[PDB]
Amino acid sequence: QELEGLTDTTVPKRLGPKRANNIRKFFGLSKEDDVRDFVIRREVTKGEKTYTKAPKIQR
């Protein structure tokens, strides 16, 4: 059976990976797949304008 607050709903992880190899192993890409475009971007709106504000890749 399924519990209402535990097994029915789910909550996403708050942040994606920030280190380059952390992204590379989170997505299983390659030796050279240029991790800069597999970066998780969180769309946020300040007003009617929206922006994505991805993390700064480290190492």
């Binding site: 059976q1 519990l3 209402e4 607050g5 535990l6 097994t7 709903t9 909550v11 996403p12 992880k13």
Partner: protein
């Protein structure tokens, strides 16, 4: 007492107020880290199994 139950697969978590002392007596004389079957504390948690991860006493 109260039961702070967390399902880490979905990341969800919820407290349950539990009465009727002979269902909470299955938790007694159990250490943190030992696993206890849920059908003893309730047929609502029947087929579940919980690991005791912590808690707070009175005061």
């Amino acid at each position: 007492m109260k039961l702070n139950i967390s399902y880490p697969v979905n990341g969800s978590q919820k407290t349950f107020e539990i009465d009727d002392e002979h269902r909470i007596r299955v938790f007694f004389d159990k250490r943190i880290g030992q696993e206890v079957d849920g059908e003893a504390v309730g047929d609502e948690f029947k087929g579940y199994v919980f690991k005791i991860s912590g808690g707070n006493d009175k005061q």
